[model samples]
Target: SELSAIETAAAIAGGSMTALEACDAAIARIEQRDGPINAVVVRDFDRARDAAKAADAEIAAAVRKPLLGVPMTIKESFDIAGLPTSWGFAEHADHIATADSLVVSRLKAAGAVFLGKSNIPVGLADWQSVNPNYGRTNNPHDHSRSAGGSSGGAAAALAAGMVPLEYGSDIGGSIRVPAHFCGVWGLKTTFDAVSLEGHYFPRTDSAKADLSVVGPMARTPADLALALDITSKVPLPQSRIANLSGLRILLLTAHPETVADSATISAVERAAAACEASGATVATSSPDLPDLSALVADYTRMLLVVLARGLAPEGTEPVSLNAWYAMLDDQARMMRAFDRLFESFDAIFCPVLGTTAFAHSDEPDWAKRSLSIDGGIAPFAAQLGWISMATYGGMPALSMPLGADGNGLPINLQIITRNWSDHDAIRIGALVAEALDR
Candidate 1:
């Protein structure tokens, strides 16, 4: 049986089991099962074991930390001290961190044992976890399909029971997309909800930019919440879990009609049905405010501008100044739209992608491949449409497993809440999970 982060941590803290034993069990699972999955890109068994032993001794002495003895992996892009921070770039393979990233330091203080770094896409750009440095990470349920990216490896490791919790970053669905594909729970908290002080590679000029957030991935909502509590700068309130009955949940099936495949739509509908069965009111009506098309357009432009500034290589010709000015103007429009949308609903539920995970392909020309969606073929970038609402609005979004497709690939639903209402998303996720037994 698999224990969530909270359960496993509590077990160690309460003297029911040693952290070393837990680490050993996780290592055994990874060694035995991850051969086909290929989710864990690096393994630090010796160091992790030592850390677990130290944590166990501390617990024995009644010195308990938040995540005492918890074993987890960070995304390959984040600095993990002693481990190379490649960001999946071959040129920077030797750029090992001299010190831990801010998030890594926090996890260490909470007594999390490092299990080495997870894989990521080359330059952390794609929606699939494949790079020259780490190769590819396959979905835990079906090796033939993608695990989603750039946090795909982190999500897959957790899904395969290699770790109870994993750390990942999100700017353009990196965290939520992977969790959706791998049957796990992921939180893309409100921008700046968590720190990103040391995650950059090559030490960029805007290394501390707040557009991206590092967050937790896990098998259960409770575990996700626990990880957030430990990692977040603003701690979650210690209130009792909310009641599920009569929770107002707004369903956004628009994307399914416009972009999603049957399998993806079916999975989301099933999740919505589970929500309805739990006494939550599910409405098909759109939030009575904001021009969604304008918001999406603006969001895409802002995302492209950020990518151009941060990820593009040196000496690369910059986008025209006119284009840049237009994008900034559009972003202002989107922000206004979002301000109106939030006045209506508690949260919006939608699919993260049009289909289940795609087939694994490492071809450099894979970007030209079109995606199949609900009897129509669309450009690859269309996949990001579902997540743009939350990303542009800077609202928190949570992704949770819905069910699996016919081919056994996992599918997921996204829950979008108003800004700073991250706890509301988690509360609804817990309710949905309980109603569906997911």
Candidate 2:
């Protein structure tokens, strides 16, 4: 088994593993395991080895850093100075970042070593990662299937034992889907919880879009929490659940817009039942929750508006301030609705995506894509509903692996909570995962 970033860093700090050794081992894994997967598409092993060499000295001097000497990878979309920050776009393949993204700067300060950039779907969109720039990343579990997109390569690299941690971004299941597909842990932080500076579109004047956040993905839930603490810039309160008996959790699996596969539904129910069996007061269903079917269309509109902000077609009319406000207005109501729901419920449990890792689809237009779920075709993008449940409302969400399905593809479920209750969600998630493992 691969070591978690926490363990690797500790080993390096305690002198059981040298920073150079950690880096070399990680690079060696990438060299041996990444060829069939194509996950480490943007290699920076030379600089990474150099950083590890220096890290060895720091360790020798007894410096303390959260991720000291941990060898990891960041999503290809993040801007690291002197490195190509192409988000799987051929047109921007030469767009070398002039400065490091804020999180990269933070990681560097924390003594983390980066072996290279992971692959991404174009513009960090989609649920399967393959692009013109990086070819394709296959699922490490089953090569015939996908690794999951946008953050697909990031998750694939971790699953293949090449790296222990990753920096992944999520808008619509970008982070969670890949983690779900690859049997890893991923967190979709509440909006603005992590800085987005220097991670902008190439040559764009405007910056980050709404409903998007960059977060940590790792092999274990504790690793996710540790990475979040280091990169958050400010102290983030974590309510490590001491007891699981007194929390109100709502479990939602079926979406009006999409149907989850048997594996996904079974996973969510099994998790909720586990929570119930653990003495937590778990509500299996609720009607007071947002009218998911009718509301998602609005979420989709606002999401499209935000994502399409930088691009406009020749005849398409630009949205007026009034129209934009109208969208935000509805989103505000949606946010408040969830806020009130959180007043009574501590957390919500749901599926990250509708299905397990499906085959890669080359369709450029997202709406035209289709996924085979339980022998039936479902609109590929509509599965975004499961993720948008948290994202559109700017909620903290965690993706924890449930288990493997019949085909051996992993099943992942989402744990969501109030806006800044990121740590609380994760704490409960840890408990939930622990109970499931029992």
Candidate 3:
């Protein structure tokens, strides 16, 4: 079992454990358990140990910090000053971050010892984490499968007990899918809630892309909340509700673009049933629900425009300035639709992905990629629509593990709330998780 970031920090503060001891323990876990997992792609054990020593001295001096002595890793895309930020690019192996990313700086200020960086797909554009620079990160549950991409190594590290917490960014279910695949908790924060400084690709700084947000991944929701509070740029609101009782929840079990396998659908239904049994009102359908198929189409268009800005193939015609503003207009209208939905429902529960972690795929072309869903092949990219709701609306979405699939892969559900209700999402997520556990 893994000790959550909160527990480890509390133990250190109470003197039951020293910072060095906690740090070394995490190092040993990585050294022992991370070899085949390959989640901790970069090793900074010596510096991490030294930082642990400093943390111990601070404690001796009666100084305190929230994550004091808690050892964790960030997605490799995040800059860590002296460490490399290659984003799994072989050519950029020599590229080192000259300064800490904003979240890294804040986490360090909160006393998180950086053991190393986790792995990600090249450009962080895939569902499976594999790159020429850092190799592949296999799922911890079954080495034959993936650990989920973009934040794959981050989730793998937490699920495999290599670390208690992780910082991951999401654009297309990057953080949520990884947490679902690894059976951990993750929050895809509201867009612009956290700064994107130092998280740029290929070691160059750029403007924050549309629909991308960095957030926390942990074994528990409290850890996610703590890390969010530490790293958020501006003040975020607290939870609006404490328990599931009396909360109006909308349950989305299907998407027109893709089919969620029976097991995945069952998990969402089970969670909704649990919530209803706990006195929470769960509605299967709502007139306020936005058109998901349309939502996905618009999201993919804007995402392509954003991602293809500089990387588009030579001679390709770029999206016109008028087209760009039109995309924003579409997004604005959708945001209003979600705002009205929130007025009627407190949360929306759905699957993070239509399927759990699948076997590793080397197919570089997403259009050609296929996943085995319910023993039939389904377009892998279509699953992105399941996560498009929160991303398109700039809302808060929390991925909470409900249980395991038939083959033992983890199954998770997404709890989405209105924009800026991040704390509310986490609080309701914790309550939903509690009810499901009971």
**Minimal lDDT window, size 10, model 1:** 202-211
Q: Give the TM-score of candidate 1.
A: 0.92
lDDT of 3 by residue, 383-410 (tens): 8998899999999999999999999999
Off by over 4 Å in 2: 310-314
Which should have the higher TM-score, number 1 or number 2?
Answer: 2
- lDDT digits (tens) for residues 111-194 of candidate 1: 889888888998788888988777889888888888988899999898888888888888889889999889899999877788
Displacement of the residue 232 alpha carbon in candidate 2, Å: 1.2
Best by lDDT: 3
lDDT string, candidate 2, 141-255, tens digits: 9998899879999999989999999989888888888999999888999888898887888865344778888999998888988889888958688886786787889988788
Q: Could you give the C-alpha RMSD of every candidate to the true structure, in order shown? A: 2.8, 1.4, 1.2
> What range of 10 consecutive residues in model 2 has the weakest lDDT sum?
198-207
The C-alpha stretches of model 1 lying farther than 4 A from their native spots are 203-206, 236-241, 256-258, 287-289, 310-333, 364-367, 374-376
> Can you list the residue pairs that collide in candidate 1?
none
Sort by lDDT, best first. Answer: 3, 2, 1
